[PDB]
Design an enzyme around this catalytic site. Structure first.
Site, PDB file in Angstrom:
ATOM      1  CE  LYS A  36      30.639  19.867  -1.272  1.00 28.78           C
ATOM      2  NZ  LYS A  36      29.442  20.123  -0.434  1.00 28.78           N
TER       3      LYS A  36
HETATM    4  C1  LIG Z   1      30.917  13.592  -2.691  1.00 27.63           C
HETATM    5  C2  LIG Z   1      30.524  14.846  -3.486  1.00 27.63           C
HETATM    6  C3  LIG Z   1      29.712  15.829  -2.992  1.00 27.63           C
HETATM    7  C4  LIG Z   1      29.065  15.820  -1.580  1.00 27.63           C
HETATM    8  C5  LIG Z   1      27.529  15.791  -1.791  1.00 27.63           C
HETATM    9  C6  LIG Z   1      26.733  14.670  -1.521  1.00 27.63           C
HETATM   10  C7  LIG Z   1      27.339  13.340  -0.965  1.00 27.63           C
HETATM   11  C8  LIG Z   1      25.344  14.742  -1.756  1.00 27.63           C
HETATM   12  O1  LIG Z   1      24.516  13.648  -1.495  1.00 27.63           O
HETATM   13  C9  LIG Z   1      24.752  15.947  -2.268  1.00 27.63           C
HETATM   14  C10 LIG Z   1      23.341  16.000  -2.495  1.00 27.63           C
HETATM   15  C11 LIG Z   1      22.757  17.172  -2.991  1.00 27.63           C
HETATM   16  C12 LIG Z   1      23.552  18.290  -3.265  1.00 27.63           C
HETATM   17  C13 LIG Z   1      24.930  18.236  -3.039  1.00 27.63           C
HETATM   18  C14 LIG Z   1      25.525  17.031  -2.529  1.00 27.63           C
HETATM   19  C15 LIG Z   1      26.931  16.972  -2.300  1.00 27.63           C
HETATM   20  O2  LIG Z   1      27.720  18.094  -2.572  1.00 27.63           O
HETATM   21  C16 LIG Z   1      31.095  15.007  -4.926  1.00 27.63           C
HETATM   22  C17 LIG Z   1      30.733  13.769  -5.829  1.00 27.63           C
HETATM   23  C18 LIG Z   1      31.337  14.001  -7.254  1.00 27.63           C
HETATM   24  C19 LIG Z   1      31.124  12.892  -8.269  1.00 27.63           C
HETATM   25  C20 LIG Z   1      31.566  11.544  -7.707  1.00 27.63           C
HETATM   26  C21 LIG Z   1      31.968  13.258  -9.506  1.00 27.63           C
HETATM   27  C22 LIG Z   1      31.245  13.015 -10.865  1.00 27.63           C
HETATM   28  C23 LIG Z   1      30.145  14.053 -11.151  1.00 27.63           C
HETATM   29  C24 LIG Z   1      30.637  15.335 -11.869  1.00 27.63           C
HETATM   30  C25 LIG Z   1      29.610  16.439 -11.664  1.00 27.63           C
HETATM   31  C26 LIG Z   1      30.797  15.083 -13.363  1.00 27.63           C
HETATM   32  C27 LIG Z   1      31.449  16.296 -14.090  1.00 27.63           C
HETATM   33  C28 LIG Z   1      32.242  15.900 -15.363  1.00 27.63           C
HETATM   34  C29 LIG Z   1      33.203  17.009 -15.796  1.00 27.63           C
HETATM   35  C30 LIG Z   1      34.039  16.576 -16.979  1.00 27.63           C
HETATM   36  C31 LIG Z   1      32.442  18.326 -16.103  1.00 27.63           C
END
Ligand SMILES: C/C(=C\Cc1c(C)c(O)c2ccccc2c1O)CCC[C@H](C)CCC[C@H](C)CCCC(C)C
Ligand SMILES: CCCCCCCCCCCCCCCCCC(=O)O[C@H](COC(=O)CCCCCCCCCCCCCCC)COP(=O)(O)OCC[N+](C)(C)C
Ligand SMILES: CCCCCCCCCCCCCCCCCC(=O)O[C@H](COC(=O)CCCCCCCCCCCCCCC)COP(=O)(O)OCC[N+](C)(C)C
Ligand SMILES: *[C@@H]1O[C@H](CO)[C@@H](O[C@@H]2O[C@H](CO)[C@@H](O)[C@H](O)[C@H]2NC(C)=O)[C@H](O)[C@H]1NC(C)=O
Ligand SMILES: *[C@@H]1O[C@H](CO)[C@@H](O[C@@H]2O[C@H](CO)[C@@H](O)[C@H](O)[C@H]2NC(C)=O)[C@H](O)[C@H]1NC(C)=O
Ligand SMILES: *[C@@H]1O[C@H](CO)[C@@H](O[C@@H]2O[C@H](CO)[C@@H](O)[C@H](O)[C@H]2NC(C)=O)[C@H](O)[C@H]1NC(C)=O
Ligand SMILES: *[C@@H]1O[C@H](CO)[C@@H](O)[C@H](O)[C@H]1NC(C)=O
Lengths: 33, 693
Positions: free
Chosen positions: B188
């Site tokens: 990525k």
């Molecule tokens: C759709 C996303 C990643 C793709 C993906 C998927 C579908 C997986 O099944 C994975 C399984 C194992 C390893 C990697 C995978 C993967 O790459 C981002 C999704 C992001 C999410 C919706 C955002 C909220 C979570 C973040 C980490 C919170 C952080 C808060 C900040 C303020 C620090």
């Protein structure tokens, strides 16, 4: 259905079939896609 | 006692010699966590087989007598008849249940592993990372001794009840999970993910509703979804390993996987990852959990006593390791190295390369590419008469992944060359023309429109010569183009094209689409109208109004690619919408008391709402009634309580499971006891499809 007319074969501007448009590969569409 | 020994769990001297390495990798360890993971994984795969593998839909995918084009990894592989396929899926189910209950563990692992990979290799259109992961985990668990705690085979044989397991059984699993994260993190680090282009429309989902309280939508679509995902993917594997950082890591990863489960339709991937995440914890957590419960519960839960010595662990007194231990250590090292190497093994198998790298499924580049197709033309020339015809884009196919890979295109071309002669066609020559855009770029050809795919030369280990290069030079235009997309009305639409030198595009504007215009953004083009055979020469910043209902051709005649656009509006739709608005206005005027004059007779059915005892309604009236009914149905659907939705969900799943079971039963009966009369088959098939209610 196995053959398409010359007129209808070339329609670039015709609306693309909006069946899972902008679809990423990692998805289980199901129902025979 | 060393601090490094405490953090990493082993001392440096343990790696000094091969014998000490084997002893370290075969040290005693508690088996409880492995058993719990085994049970969860077996349950998830059992729930997954009737849903995603396709046993519920298998009776119309491998149907006998149907002529379809398959995409197997090896051309030698061919599907068996339907009944034997049902038997194979039954063996899969039995193996999964055996793994879940831990009964005859090795045979269960084999019976699940071999059929799963047979099905996986039989179709390249069903490859995804979460299927390759299940295959890898099944392969790993076939050798790990996960039946030493909480297993029926433990009850059957005393010697394998609550016994020690070697450390490498854990290590490989841990490593696997780490790779699944870490490789994704480095995948990525692409210009299309760090900049917010991929998955740009995932920031509107209501699960991100709280985040919008503090940040705008545009920044919410870059900081949270894209950068946060990258940071979590890179850092989670290290956070979970170390003791100090385990709690925050578990919380963040669980939140991440829950949001992925709700946002996407991955299926069982999120639940499997949640099951695997606790495996980084201490190997004895279920035992201490069982200890902290009332005595009444302990009378039914697994044992709490200490594990007994086993024969599959090297105990220090000095014992010379045998053959199982050395093989285990070698397997761990080689398997982890192969897992690291395979995702970057695309420099050897260049035949499968495309705009992206290699087939999807074994690269761990999850959700970093979106494709939007515009048109697909399949032209065929008969080899006897010379007649030229056009086929339907997706004939004799069950997926739509042949538009993006050269090898699948070659297989489809050969399939057509073999099937068409049944339709009074001699030895044909097939040409393809496909338009595709990756991450909102200019729409460009992927395959050369002048190369016969049937006689084209393709080998797995040599680069394909008929795949158009990706025009990376037009990457920055994605900014400016976006502005034009937001400067249009609610009716006008725009489609962008980027074309190579020499080629030409022939288009036929439909009669409905009046007011179609062409504007050139970069390069030199020439536009030919064939109705009067007149060609003009367009340069930068020139706009032309093309005819509607005829053919026009566009040629590129510059040393460099040419980029232009079509802007069009559906005039028929505009007229229909205006007429519908007029009719609705008249209806409202009649309803509110205005328009005291008598209603037209055609209006009377609208107020009545039913075509009974009168002339058939006009097409406009039929369209209006259909739209009103659709709006009413949508309103009824929206105003639905949660419990009804949950009940419908459960009932649909119950129907899927029941149909799977009954179809399997009829198939097994047909295979074993023979086929009854055709009326009986019809009756039983009718019974199978009956809705439960
Ligand atoms: C759709 C996303 C990643 C793709 C993906 C998927 C579908 C997986 O099944 C994975 C399984 C194992 C390893 C990697 C995978 C993967 O790459 C981002 C999704 C992001 C999410 C919706 C955002 C909220 C979570 C973040 C980490 C919170 C952080 C808060 C900040 C303020 C620090
Ligand atoms: C002559 C030949 C000489 C040898 C050459 C080859 C040398 C190979 C060296 C590399 C392989 C070493 C294997 C070590 C195996 C091992 O120790 O297994 C484990 C180590 O765990 C693993 O297997 C981890 C797998 C990878 C996890 C993800 C990456 C972690 C990176 C950490 C920073 C480095 C012992 O762990 P434990 O249960 O004692 O827990 C310790 C950690 N705490 C306390 C926090 C829970
Ligand atoms: C130690 C523990 C450590 C933590 C472990 C955490 C992980 C545990 C995982 C265990 C499995 C949990 C359940 C999984 C449920 C599940 O996956 O649900 C589904 C699949 O599972 C199911 O549907 C299972 C249904 C089984 C059938 C149950 C029938 C029950 C009937 C009850 C009686 C009804 C009587 C009615 C008449 C009175 C996923 O949905 P999908 O893939 O179709 O996607 C749809 C949703 N969208 C569109 C958003 C994608
Ligand atoms: C066809 O031409 C374009 C779309 O292809 C549209 O014309 C717009 O016309 C209005 C008239 O006031 C202008 O305000 C807009 O700026 C125009 N859009 C442009 C230039 O992109 C409209 O859909 C059609 N116009 C006619 C005259 O049929
Ligand atoms: C309009 O101009 C175009 C571009 O110069 C002409 O296109 C070519 O068509 C001729 C037809 O004899 C072919 O021999 C050439 O190979 C074509 N050139 C390219 C680069 O493809 C087009 O024929 C002209 N139209 C008319 C009606 O004269
Ligand atoms: C343009 O708009 C028209 C409506 O004005 C669309 O028309 C209907 O299109 C469907 C297929 O999408 C046909 O089955 C209907 O018969 C059409 N309605 C009619 C003729 O009244 C049309 O599809 C849109 N697109 C194109 C390319 O014309
Ligand atoms: C022409 O092709 C059709 C395709 O269905 C076939 O049924 C028919 O027999 C063919 N006719 C001749 C004269 O070969």
């Amino acid at each position: 259905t196995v053959f398409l007319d010359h007129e209808n074969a070339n329609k670039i501007l015709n609306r693309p079939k909006r069946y899972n448009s902008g679809k990423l590969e990692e998805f289980v569409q199901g129902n025979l896609e | 006692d060393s601090r490094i020994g405490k953090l990493l769990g082993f001392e440096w001297t343990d790696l000094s010699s091969w014998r000490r390495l084997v002893t370290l990798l075969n040290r005693p360890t508690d088996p409880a966590s492995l058993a719990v993971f085994r049970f969860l994984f077996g349950f998830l795969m059992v729930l997954d087989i009737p849903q995603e593998r396709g046993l519920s839909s298998l009776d119309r995918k491998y149907l006998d007598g149907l002529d379809v084009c398959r995409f197997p990894l090896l051309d030698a592989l061919r599907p068996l008849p339907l009944d034997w396929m049902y038997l194979v899926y039954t063996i899969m189910f039995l193996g999964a249940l055996g793994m879940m209950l831990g009964l005859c563990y090795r045979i269960s692992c084999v019976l699940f592993l071999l059929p799963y990979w047979y099905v996986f290799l039989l179709d390249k259109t069903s490859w995804n990372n979460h299927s390759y992961l299940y295959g890898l985990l099944a392969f790993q668990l076939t050798f790990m001794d996960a039946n030493h705690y909480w297993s029926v085979d433990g009850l059957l044989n005393a010697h394998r009840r609550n016994a020690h397991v070697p450390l490498w059984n854990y290590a490989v699993l841990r490593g696997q999970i780490f790779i699944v994260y870490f490789i994704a993190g480095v995948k990525k680090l692409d210009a299309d993910w760090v900049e917010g282009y991929s998955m740009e429309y995932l920031s509107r989902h209501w699960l991100f509703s709280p985040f919008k309280l503090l940040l705008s939508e545009e920044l919410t679509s870059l900081l949270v979804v894209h950068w946060g995902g990258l940071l979590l993917d890179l850092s989670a594997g290290f956070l979970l390993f170390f003791d100090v950082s385990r709690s925050i890591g578990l919380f963040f990863v669980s939140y991440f996987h829950c949001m992925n489960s709700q946002l996407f339709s991955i299926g069982m991937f999120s639940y499997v990852m949640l099951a695997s995440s606790p495996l980084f914890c201490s190997p004895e957590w279920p035992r201490k959990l069982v200890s902290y419960c009332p005595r009444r519960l302990q009378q039914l839960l697994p044992l709490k006593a200490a594990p007994q010595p086993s024969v599959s662990c090297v105990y220090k007194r000095g014992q010379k390791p045998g053959l199982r231990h050395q093989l285990g250590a070698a397997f761990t090292l080689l398997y982890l190295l192969e897992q690291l190497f395979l995702p970057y093994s695309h420099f050897l198998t260049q035949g499968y390369n495309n705009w992206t790298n290699g087939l999807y499924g074994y690269s761990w580049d999850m959700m970093v590419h979106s494709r939007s197709h515009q048109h697909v033309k399949i032209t065929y020339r008969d080899g006897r008469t010379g007649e030229l015809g056009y086929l339907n884009p997706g004939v004799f196919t069950q997926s739509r992944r042949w538009k993006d890979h050269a090898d699948m295109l070659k297989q489809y071309a050969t399939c057509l060359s073999r099937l068409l002669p049944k339709y009074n066609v001699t030895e044909p020559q097939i040409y393809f023309d496909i338009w595709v855009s990756i991450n909102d770029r200019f729409q460009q050809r992927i395959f050369d429109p002048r190369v016969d795919i049937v006689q084209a030369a393709w080998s797995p280990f040599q680069r394909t010569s008929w795949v158009q290069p990706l025009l990376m030079d037009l990457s920055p235009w994605r900014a400016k183009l976006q502005e034009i997309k937001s400067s249009l009305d609610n009716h006008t639409e725009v489609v962008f094209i980027a074309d190579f030198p020499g080629l030409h595009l022939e288009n036929f504007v439909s009669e409905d689409l009046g007011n179609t215009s062409i504007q050139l953004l970069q390069g030199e083009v020439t536009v030919e109208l064939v109705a009067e055979q007149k060609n003009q020469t367009l340069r930068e910043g020139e706009k032309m109004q093309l005819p509607a209902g005829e053919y026009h051709k566009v040629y590129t005649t510059s040393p460099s690619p040419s980029c232009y656009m079509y802007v069009y509006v559906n005039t028929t739709e505009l007229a229909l919408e205006q007429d519908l608005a007029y009719l609705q206005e008249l209806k409202e005027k009649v309803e509110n008391g205005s328009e005291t004059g008598p209603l037209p007779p055609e209006l009377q059915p609208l107020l009545e709402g039913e075509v009974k005892g009168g002339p058939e309604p006009t097409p406009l009236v039929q369209t209006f009634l259909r739209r009103q009914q659709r709006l009413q149905e949508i309103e009824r659907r929206r105003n639905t309580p949660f419990h009804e939705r949950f009940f419908r969900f459960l009932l649909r799943k119950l129907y899927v499971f029941r149909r799977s079971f009954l179809m399997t039963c009829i198939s097994l009966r047909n295979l074993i006891l023979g086929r009854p009369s055709l009326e009986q088959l019809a009756q039983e098939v009718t019974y199978a499809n009956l809705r439960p209610f």
